């Protein structure tokens, strides 16, 4: 795999919308530049599918941020999301109608 092949594969894993039309050989000149090679090798290793935020979630989070509602920090999110273990509580009142 050339340096260009490896870059095009990382762009495909990152869901770049033109990633299927890119050929690997067209990018090999980026890896001939001795001084830029360490940064490109890092980018190709550090970026994964779990790092991608889709445009709808970015927009919805920006509207959440514009709505003036408080944005919970990571620890508060873990405490709230732990307490928000998916309690099948809608089943208890629905079971009261089914029993009746």
């Amino acid at each position: 795999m050339s340096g260009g092949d490896r870059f095009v594969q990382t762009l495909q894993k990152l869901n770049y919308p033109k990633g299927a039309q890119l050929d690997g050989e067209d990018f090999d000149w980026l890896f001939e530049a001795v001084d830029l090679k360490p940064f490109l090798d890092w980018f190709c290793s550090a970026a994964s599918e779990q790092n991608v935020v889709p445009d709808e979630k970015l927009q919805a989070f920006n509207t959440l941020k514009e709505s003036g509602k408080p944005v919970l920090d990571e620890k508060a999110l873990d405490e709230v999301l732990k307490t928000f273990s998916i309690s099948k509580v809608p089943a208890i009142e629905e079971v009261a109608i089914e029993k009746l």
Partner: protein, 103 residues
Amino acid sequence: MERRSLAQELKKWAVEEMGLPAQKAPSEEMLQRLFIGQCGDIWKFIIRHIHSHRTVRKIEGNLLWYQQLQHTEAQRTAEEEQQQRRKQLCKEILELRAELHHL
């Protein structure tokens, strides 16, 4: 002028968002060579959509949280219809128990 601002945003994204140590970050003049031809649009997408795993969790879990909170408000209007149906069923049970007693 545009290729210089994109070099700056990419350096900022690499150091602040993705956590690259600043001594390993190439110079802003070196980064400008990455915006030749079609590569300019590629790096714009990367800066906008690719976040740290920590930032992704904060975004997704706050969205999930407020979706669950709205689902609990919409559940109250369904609880009122369920309370009306429960009153209807309890009234029908009382009428049926009274008819059963008379039978």
